[PDB]
Symmetry: D3
Subunit: 231 residues, 6 copies
Amino acid sequence: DYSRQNFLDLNLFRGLGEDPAYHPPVLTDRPRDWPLDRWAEAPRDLGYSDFSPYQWRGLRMLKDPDTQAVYHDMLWELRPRTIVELGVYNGGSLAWFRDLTKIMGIDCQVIGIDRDLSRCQIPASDMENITLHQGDCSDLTTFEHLREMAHPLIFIDDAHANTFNIMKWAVDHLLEEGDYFIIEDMIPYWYRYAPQLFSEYLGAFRDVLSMDMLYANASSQLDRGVLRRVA
Amino acid sequence: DYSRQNFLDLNLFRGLGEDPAYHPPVLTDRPRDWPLDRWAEAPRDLGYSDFSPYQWRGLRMLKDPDTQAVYHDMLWELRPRTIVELGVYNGGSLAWFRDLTKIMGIDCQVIGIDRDLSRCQIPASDMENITLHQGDCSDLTTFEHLREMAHPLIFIDDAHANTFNIMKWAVDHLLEEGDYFIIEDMIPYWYRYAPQLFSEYLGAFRDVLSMDMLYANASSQLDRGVLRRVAA
Amino acid sequence: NDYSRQNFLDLNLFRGLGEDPAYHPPVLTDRPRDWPLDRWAEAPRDLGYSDFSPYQWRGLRMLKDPDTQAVYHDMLWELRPRTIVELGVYNGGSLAWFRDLTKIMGIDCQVIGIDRDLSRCQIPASDMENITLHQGDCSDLTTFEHLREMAHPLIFIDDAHANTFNIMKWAVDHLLEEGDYFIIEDMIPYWYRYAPQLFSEYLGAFRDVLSMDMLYANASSQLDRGVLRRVA
Amino acid sequence: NDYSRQNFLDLNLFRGLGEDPAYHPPVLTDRPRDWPLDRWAEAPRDLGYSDFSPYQWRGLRMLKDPDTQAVYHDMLWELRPRTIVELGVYNGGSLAWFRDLTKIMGIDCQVIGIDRDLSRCQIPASDMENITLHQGDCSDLTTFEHLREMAHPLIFIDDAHANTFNIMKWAVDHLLEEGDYFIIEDMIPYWYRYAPQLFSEYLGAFRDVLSMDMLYANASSQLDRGVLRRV
Amino acid sequence: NDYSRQNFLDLNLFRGLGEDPAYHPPVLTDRPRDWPLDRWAEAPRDLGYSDFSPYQWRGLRMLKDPDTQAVYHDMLWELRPRTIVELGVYNGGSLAWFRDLTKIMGIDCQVIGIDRDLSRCQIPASDMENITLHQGDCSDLTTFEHLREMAHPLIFIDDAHANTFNIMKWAVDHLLEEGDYFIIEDMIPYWYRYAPQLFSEYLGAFRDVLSMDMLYANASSQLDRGVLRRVAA
Amino acid sequence: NDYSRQNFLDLNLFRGLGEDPAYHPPVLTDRPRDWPLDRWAEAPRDLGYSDFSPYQWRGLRMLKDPDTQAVYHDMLWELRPRTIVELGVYNGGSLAWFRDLTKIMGIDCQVIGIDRDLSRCQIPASDMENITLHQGDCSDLTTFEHLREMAHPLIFIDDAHANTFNIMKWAVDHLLEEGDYFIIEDMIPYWYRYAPQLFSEYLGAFRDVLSMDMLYANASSQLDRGVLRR
Ligand SMILES: C[S@+](CC[C@H](N)C(=O)[O-])C[C@H]1O[C@@H](n2cnc3c(N)ncnc32)[C@H](O)[C@@H]1O
Ligand SMILES: C[S@+](CC[C@H](N)C(=O)[O-])C[C@H]1O[C@@H](n2cnc3c(N)ncnc32)[C@H](O)[C@@H]1O
Ligand SMILES: C[S@@+](CC[C@H](N)C(=O)[O-])C[C@H]1O[C@@H](n2cnc3c(N)ncnc32)[C@H](O)[C@@H]1O
Ligand SMILES: C[S@@+](CC[C@H](N)C(=O)[O-])C[C@H]1O[C@@H](n2cnc3c(N)ncnc32)[C@H](O)[C@@H]1O
Ligand SMILES: C[S@@+](CC[C@H](N)C(=O)[O-])C[C@H]1O[C@@H](n2cnc3c(N)ncnc32)[C@H](O)[C@@H]1O
Ligand SMILES: [Mg+2]
Ligand SMILES: [Mg+2]
Ligand SMILES: [Mg+2]
Ligand SMILES: [Mg+2]
Ligand SMILES: [Mg+2]
Ligand SMILES: [Mg+2]
């Protein structure tokens, strides 16, 4: 088996999964319809190992429900005119953000940037108020090609490359008082691995960004990574 | 002062709160804008009560995030034409179910039943495809006066009163194959307090209802309480 | 279809009580009672039965768990109350226990029980020395005004959880003297969770007449932050 | 340099017991006993003093914590013992408790306590009805030989924790009848930890005479897997 | 302000490593080192510094924490390896430790560190007895082809986590004899989380050659379900 | 009936030691050593043997667990002790470890083990280099008065736990120099719990001569709040 098979690097699926396309979970060790006469003997665990088993309208979502409630609250209060997502994957959170603002009556343009848009599962007929843009975050030439968009604005780092140089770029070019810059996932790990540089780098933005303590502790993905532009 | 006062029974607010109207959390022991030069010294706890801090479009929502996820998947799968909810309170979940079905392209009437609609706060401008009904759940006539409903259907007990007689009524007079009958919150408590009677009660429905294992363990509010109608 | 051959009680009747007020010794199911000592190490480690309210006193169900009993023992040994009033009797377990404890300690104490329904009380007719029963609703302050004078010190215990703050106001003005207790069992953590603004205002109204007794207030989950006494 | 003046007692003398046999009511160290109700939400939530062995019965210390008390209540109510031998006494709170408890149940029970040292016993002489104290060492089997006229049923409790297994032999042969209990408090878990193969061998020797009562044997951490009775 | 003047490193450069491969003792910031004994009760109970990776060996940082050292000690003692390979070297603390432990145990064992970048290695040149350094990328199997043929038993440790299953395939067919270990540190729990189906199949293709050693595989959180060896069933 | 004939040892003899001073590797009972990889996810995740005191060094049982070994490694690295006294020797595992660790650090350290009973000790004579054993009860001070003069710096470790505070007094008055350590293992949490009042007084009697070293005192559950110096 091993000799007649070339192996993929499982690092490619880091925090993403094996398949960008959504598939409902399969139960492997119980029936789906458990009989009520044996109700007490039914197993109490989830029944499936699916990595991040969350979806919006048939599209995988890497934002888990607690993260979703924070963004709900944030969209409701800010009524953002632009949401930029750095890192697209399957585009599920793109479609989620456009749909949420649509239901809230907020006229919001959702912009998604990725190096690799081939994984995006959103059909063409469902792309109203959603623009894609191919390009690396490993270089800032990607971001300069932006038709100057409306405010308020939420800028979400979901690609985790060159992040502080991008935050610098965002303060110098794009962000206005009240706008958010959000770093998903990485902050607690960066403080863990490099406390001193992290403390200094974040501290270099003391006069331009603050940490929003309404939302910063409300989800584990956004944990201490919700920042906004101060006056 | 206590001599002046006359004190309300706080049990009125059990599992609810004191104001059906939503208000953003209020920070008590910290500023909203933490300085980044002191990022490491910032308090790590939530900063407010975790009781029921959720909302949908300015309306309080007593369905927490993991519950919302189960209901999204369920709505996406079943594509229900009618959702009935016992217990309306502020209307948050009614507006949410209506909204979620609408953005999915599903034609879904949402129906709310409650003995007290005076706390519902969904503006009429936002009430499309929602029908409220006043009536006590303890009285079966509340349900006998309901009109024909389209299927598939999801019937959700959130009032917690007279539940097993209501489930009996729904099986004989409403639920068709594939429909859900969900009991929110109550099942772990009833089983803890009255395990033998609960088991016997639930097992009495063994030929008509099954526990849906895809959803029954995925949220603590819905825990062991997601049921659906099986073939006759 | 057993459900159609049955009527269903509201399982809310058994909230935090259980199905049967009579005590029955717990019974093992998935193991023999006598485990052979050659297989000692393979014996299951779990309780073997439900840990919901399994406590008793001389064949009467007792809804006070051991840590609560420890608190009341200490409190009785310090205060030596002449009177113990218990709102909410259920099956009489804590009544007989309060009378028995005070008798062992050489304390001449009258125990009084107040309940809307004394039909579940299982105390033998022969074991009612220094115990008095009153049928009445806590929702009417009449129940308490008609009570005849009682000796002090005195411990008043809310275990019925209805009209609690109006009763506390009544008890401060017309019953409690310096050093007497008013104890709200179980309920205080829940009211603070569900109604923090009103709960803090209501408790604050009593700031000049009652204080939290920190020696007992944190020593049991049932009495958690619920032990108060009269000031001069 | 105060260390040079003193002779230091061996703190191992106080192992699992405390400094003083006499009961001393807990002292709140960092709070007032009366907490103002207008600042109710600010009050500390922890116990407020050491939870080591703060339990008592009628002004005497009790080294049996409440969960153990409840087990022994259930066992006394079921068995209705005419005799309760306590090996190891200390202050005598357990003696007075067992005697008081049997007495309110209408059980006519004699309570016998054995100990090498009865000077720590604090039961007043007036309050010694149906209690008998005996001064011997547990290691030496002659202590037990010197009386055995006891009515049944009978509960035998080891709190001395010395020469326990030889004592259990003498018990099965020269004392216990069908239904009588033999209880090893506290030590069983620890002896399985340090000497599993030996403990298993020693215990397994009693397979034909004694069994583990599974109704009571997991109901309290002090009694954990130490409640045995004759079959 | 200060951010305007700065150019920021990608903090992923330090993922699981730290900012400095050189060892620096922890230092206290919020208490005195010498706590007075008359106030012993009041002294804080927490560690007093970051527990990320504070471990060392003879002045060199060690990314293998104590419970993992205890497992490798047992395994060295039982197996008595003549060769220990270490994919990914970093500062060389583990290399110096493996060589020292085998030396103290009386085992004649060569230690071979492989890595794309050996500049971070802090082992003094005067203390490199029975240690060999090869510089090459792990993604490319050219790095292992030119390796001299080593004595067995052998322990092969993946601490670089790149192209890991192609290297495991190559190890089985070109290097691993019966009894030898192939240890994947850190990654297995994470790979099963993100890619449960693809991971279970890949591992399972080695069911005829490799097995999981249950004496060591649950004995440390870094080695968690990743101690394999060329042994049957 | 196997019980009627047997004469049972006191199991308290094994309190905190175990039944055998010699090292025997852990053994699997409820599973195979080689789990098949096609059932990898099915394999049990628990350790599979008793976690009591499974540790060793060179075929010798070691009652110092891994977290305690890291603390002592750091302490040796920083202080560079010329002498290490261990009260309580048992199998001699900690002693051989201490000698080995000092030697590989290039430190010239004599290790001195004291114990009432040296019969359990199992170091081969071949590996006894730089280890001096002494027989004596800790329960009486004569054991320490017969000790010869020792090189500094020095680490005095108590693992016997008898007569400890008197021995600490002796050590301050007759042995310890500035910078030297006196470490009480295992016992300090327990003595505070059972006798907080006398323990506080006793430890506080030493306030002018010893201090709790906070860099090491909270780093191990065996050394927890018992790492002292000066
Ligand atoms: C899947 S996450 C995006 C999260 C997504 N918006 C969501 O929450 O559903 C990471 C994505 O960022 C992309 N990415 C990683 N590094 C990048 C880089 N250097 N430049 C552009 N995109 C990158 C990956 O292709 C991947 O699709
Ligand atoms: C807050 S929950 C409703 C949950 C709501 N759907 C949500 O998630 O936002 C409880 C509601 O049930 C109602 N209720 C309680 N008992 C009832 C009864 N017997 N009949 C009808 N409604 C009842 C209460 O008035 C209250 O509004
Ligand atoms: C928890 S039981 C009492 C516990 C009992 N004191 C003990 O410790 O074992 C609650 C009792 O309160 C009674 N009860 C509930 N509401 C009441 C009310 N409004 N007035 C009087 N009794 C009430 C119920 O009938 C029930 O017997
Ligand atoms: C744990 S205390 C007894 C506590 C009390 N019986 C209870 O359960 O609440 C242990 C007692 O056993 C006694 N003891 C300890 N070793 C003994 C021995 N070898 N022989 C006789 N008595 C002993 C001690 O004097 C001490 O008072
Ligand atoms: C976890 S550290 C090595 C652990 C070290 N042997 C120890 O335990 O003390 C990871 C090392 O692997 C190296 N590395 C990362 N990716 C690599 C690759 N693709 N090829 C070769 N080495 C790589 C890094 O440069 C780094 O030095
Ligand atoms: Mg992300
Ligand atoms: Mg509810
Ligand atoms: Mg209660
Ligand atoms: Mg004891
Ligand atoms: Mg690693
Ligand atoms: Mg030790």
